[PDB]
Amino acid sequence: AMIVGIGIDIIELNRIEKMLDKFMERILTENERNVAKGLKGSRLTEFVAGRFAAKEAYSKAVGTGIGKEVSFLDIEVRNDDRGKPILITSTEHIVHLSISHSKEFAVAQVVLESS
Amino acid sequence: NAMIVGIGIDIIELNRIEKMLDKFMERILTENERNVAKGLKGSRLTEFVAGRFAAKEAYSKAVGTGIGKEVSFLDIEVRNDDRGKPILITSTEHIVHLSISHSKEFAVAQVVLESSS
Amino acid sequence: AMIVGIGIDIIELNRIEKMLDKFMERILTENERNVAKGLKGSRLTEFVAGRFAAKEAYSKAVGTGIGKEVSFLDIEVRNDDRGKPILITSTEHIVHLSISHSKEFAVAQVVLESSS
Ligand SMILES: Nc1ncnc2c1ncn2[C@@H]1O[C@H](COP(=O)(O)O)[C@@H](OP(=O)(O)O)[C@H]1O
Ligand SMILES: Nc1ncnc2c1ncn2[C@@H]1O[C@H](COP(=O)(O)O)[C@@H](OP(=O)(O)O)[C@H]1O
Ligand SMILES: Nc1ncnc2c1ncn2[C@@H]1O[C@H](COP(=O)(O)O)[C@@H](OP(=O)(O)O)[C@H]1O
Ligand SMILES: Nc1ncnc2c1ncn2[C@@H]1O[C@H](COP(=O)(O)O)[C@@H](OP(=O)(O)O)[C@H]1O
Ligand SMILES: Nc1ncnc2c1ncn2[C@@H]1O[C@H](COP(=O)(O)O)[C@@H](OP(=O)(O)O)[C@H]1O
Ligand SMILES: Nc1ncnc2c1ncn2[C@@H]1O[C@H](COP(=O)(O)O)[C@@H](OP(=O)(O)O)[C@H]1O
Ligand SMILES: [Cl-]
Ligand SMILES: [Cl-]
Ligand SMILES: [Cl-]
Ligand SMILES: [Cl-]
Ligand SMILES: [Cl-]
Ligand SMILES: [Cl-]
Ligand SMILES: [Mg+2]
Ligand SMILES: [Mg+2]
Ligand SMILES: [Mg+2]
Ligand SMILES: [Mg+2]
Ligand SMILES: [Mg+2]
Ligand SMILES: [Mg+2]
Ligand SMILES: [Mg+2]
Ligand SMILES: [Mg+2]
Ligand SMILES: [Mg+2]
């Protein structure tokens, strides 16, 4: 039983942009917000959307969705020195993540692997 | 001997499915799925049919054949478990991993087929 | 340590189309351009777009993105006899790939698996 689950999510950026007009306090952890403070405009919108999509994708990979087991603030998406997104949450599994965002959409995928 | 036999992804414009809906469903949805579709309306029915189409198509790409003589729409059933997680049921010796998502205008599905040996 | 990495990419087709109207020579290898040479209109655009995205998604799977270790011309995406996309590049890993394209968007994903 190597793959524990997979999850994908697609988000319309304008939906996030609208929700941004305290939404970020609900989606992004303290560390993520400190990164977001240095972003603006479309970049901030796509960053928030990317994180949302990553966390949701991850919650689908576990099979529960955002809820009592896993919510937004239990997860932190960090970018490594190369810019590669790393998902940090308490779990026995290996989390593989990827994100992409065009001008109007963001997508994220997660593959959970047994350790 | 790869543990992953194949992967598949599909993106579908919801307005295209909505037009096709305006019988299309009898071709894409099995009987259990249509019974589930019966209780849906408007955007929900459209996104539901779209997600099924995409899950099935994505699965067929994971097998590497696409929808055709080996695999077609009616050989596959996508049911949601009690938590809402989509489960793909078809005759195969492999483990099927699936995920679906649908915004207001797009639906996306992905499949990863894993070897059970 | 089964999966070495995964990569996803979404591209707006009209963006690639604008870049087309030089560019293909930067994104497509010789073999790939000989295929593209027989395509036109939206089919050529989606084709190039799916290649861009496949190659970009592969580079994310590697964890470096397009750059000094992996660039577009180091990678060739072929279609087998059934139409399935096969990613050909220098690596010790098994490359799993998929592409999809609607009227307005192309998406590609990659899962890299370790051989051992
Ligand atoms: N000639 C070119 N060919 C391919 N990609 C290009 C390009 N010029 C810019 N880009 C990419 O398109 C995006 C536009 O960003 P910018 O505002 O700096 O132009 C950037 O990528 P990302 O979208 O991956 O960051 C950038 O790398
Ligand atoms: N038999 C098969 N198995 C897996 N993938 C396939 C396939 N035949 C075609 N594809 C992929 O499906 C892509 C298009 O998907 P969709 O029809 O969802 O847009 C193709 O884009 P290319 O033909 O540009 O390579 C191809 O890469
Ligand atoms: N607990 C759960 N785990 C994994 N996936 C789930 C889930 N609950 C719902 N989903 C999937 O998420 C899809 C919708 O994703 P999103 O909300 O991002 O649009 C659902 O589409 P269906 O209800 O059409 O099957 C369903 O397949
Ligand atoms: N304040 C909020 N923050 C984040 N998501 C919200 C929200 N209010 C509603 N949503 C989500 O956005 C969608 C809105 O649907 P509606 O408002 O018509 O019920 C639902 O998710 P899904 O699309 O995942 O089902 C819902 O859970
Ligand atoms: N070296 C790398 N390897 C893998 N993924 C990377 C990467 N550098 C950046 N990314 C991911 O690519 C995303 C953008 O994708 P695209 O260029 O296709 O829009 C980034 O979103 P964030 O910068 O918002 O975290 C990031 O998570
Ligand atoms: N009645 C039908 N039901 C489902 N799909 C159909 C269809 N008629 C055509 N298609 C699909 O619509 C796409 C474009 O149509 P055409 O090439 O005939 O103009 C093709 O798929 P792809 O987009 O996967 O190639 C084709 O297979
Ligand atoms: Cl959305
Ligand atoms: Cl992001
Ligand atoms: Cl959720
Ligand atoms: Cl098909
Ligand atoms: Cl784009
Ligand atoms: Cl890149
Ligand atoms: Mg969602
Ligand atoms: Mg982007
Ligand atoms: Mg398709
Ligand atoms: Mg949902
Ligand atoms: Mg939805
Ligand atoms: Mg990209
Ligand atoms: Mg980038
Ligand atoms: Mg097709
Ligand atoms: Mg297409």
Residue numbers in the entry:
A (entry chain B): 0 to 20, 24 to 117
B (entry chain A): -1 to 20, 24 to 118
C (entry chain C): 0 to 20, 24 to 118
Paper text:
The active form of ACP is produced by a post-translational modification of a conserved serine residue of apo-ACP by a 4′-phosphopantetheine (P-pant) group transferred from CoA bound to a holo-(acyl-carrier-protein) synthase (AcpS). AcpS belongs to the phosphopantetheine transferase (PPT) family of proteins, binds CoA and its derivatives and requires magnesium for activity. The AcpS trimer binds three CoA molecules and three ACP molecules. The AcpS monomer has an elongated elliptical shape and possesses an α/β fold.
The structure of AcpSBA is emphasized because of the two 3′,5′-adenosine diphosphate (3′,5′-ADP) product molecules that are found in each of the three coenzyme A (CoA) binding sites of the trimeric protein. One 3′,5′-ADP is bound as the 3′,5′-ADP part of CoA in the known structures of the CoA–AcpS and 3′,5′-ADP–AcpS binary complexes. It is in close proximity to the first 3′,5′-­ADP and the ACP-binding site. Lastly, it is important to stress the specific ADPI 5′-P–ADPII 3′-P interaction through Mg-III.
